[PDB]
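Coactosin-like protein (Homo sapiens), 141 aa
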Amino acid sequence: ATKIDKEACRAAYNLVRDDGSAVIWVTFKYDGSTIVPGEQGAEYQHFIQQCTDDVRLFAFVRFTTGDAMSKRSKFALITWIGENVSGLQRAKTGTDKTLVKEVVQNFAKEFVISDRKELEENFIKSELKKAGGANYDAQTE
């Protein structure tokens, strides 16, 4: 029943790969019975407002860790699951995570989040930047 559109998923990925346009993050939701990317903007504020604790969907945001010394990019797969995740949707999250896993062969970090503060931009970038630190975080700075 659940299927992932390689064409759509790939299309959005290509756009995210380009660091020239005003696009950094992209959504990932399924309509009817097929997964397909969503909103694509530079303003993450939209993602925070759209991803509320009352549904279940996927996401894809890329962050660049550099400062006139080492300009580099990094992939980040965020899976949002608002508490209003029904039993059918709950199991779907794990299954869907597998579908996307195969779709994205070259990734950096992918994890699930159930908190707005945890899904916040500062939190995502922190995980990507550290990728194995001594948990020396407090204000996600």
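Strands lie at 25-30, 35-41, 56-64, 73-81, 109-113. The first strand starts at residue 25 and ends at 30. ok done for today
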